[PDB]
Amino acid sequence: GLPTCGETCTLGTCYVPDCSCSWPICMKN
């Protein structure tokens, strides 16, 4: 739930370790 990944999975993929795609932004828990 925390978008502290600093990544946007516009395509639907987050390269940031353990970061879940919370389209369009990646969030960890």
Tally of domains in the chain: 1
Cβ neighbours of residue 14 closer than 8 Å, sequence gap 6 or more? 5, 7, 20, 21, 26
Joined together, the tokens standing for residue 15 give 């390269």
| Structural domain span for residue 5 | 1-29
DSSP per-residue codes, 1-29: -B-TT----SSS---STT-EEETTEEEB-
Q: Are 27 and 6 in contact (CB under 8 A)?
A: no
Q: Give the torsion through C-alpha atoms of 18, 21, 24, 26, to 10 deg.
A: -10
**Which technique?**
NMR
